[PDB]
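DM from R.C. (forwarded with permission)

"hey, sorry to bug you on a friday — could you get me a structure for this? deadline for the figure draft is monday and I only need the backbone to look sensible"
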Amino acid sequence: SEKIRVDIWSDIACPWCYIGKRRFESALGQFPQRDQVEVVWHSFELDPSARPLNPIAMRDGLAMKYSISPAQAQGSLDHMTQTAAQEGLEYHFDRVKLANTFLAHQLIHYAAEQGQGDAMKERLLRAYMSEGQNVNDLDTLQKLAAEVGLDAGAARAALEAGTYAQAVRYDEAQAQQLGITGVPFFVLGGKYGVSGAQAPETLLGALSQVWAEQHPAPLTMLGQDAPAEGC
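My reply, with the result:
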């Protein structure tokens, strides 16, 4: 109606996802009807089979993943770092802890039930990309939950109990069912998809298109009421 739902699939271990988050926020800031937009974050794992913690350098993990030389991998890290800097993000890839992000995604699901999904997602992206934190570590997750303003003890309990594990897996199944094979991925009005960290202009256009489609111009009525049937 007078609401626009934006579903975003993303991983915490995804530098393009943090860049994409900022580009979307730029778009949203430019969108007149931004107050009518509801953003829902959805879980996506680039490597659901990842070790709890993989001790190697991000550069070497990247080089293994894409089958390239160390210098090529470093070049790629340098590109993402420079690009992120334009969004005001200060990456520290040399500090990144290559962690399984399953539990972190559970924490975002917990947070979302308190209406703090975006703040939790944000905190975890910063913790991963910039602060060299281990987002598979339960104490670390508990602390980040506290910093977001959540009930730290309750968040920790939900994580240890695996309460949101099924919901995380459903989010990931959803993505595959939708043909989502890379992140960030934006869905608007359950109708339109936008793949990757698109420029703010593109996302602004998408919001505006959906809003316009949900607001046809009022009709000019002709004649008087003839026999009809209502609900």
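R.C.: lifesaver. The longest strand covers residues 4-10.
me: no worries. The longest helix spans residues 70-86.
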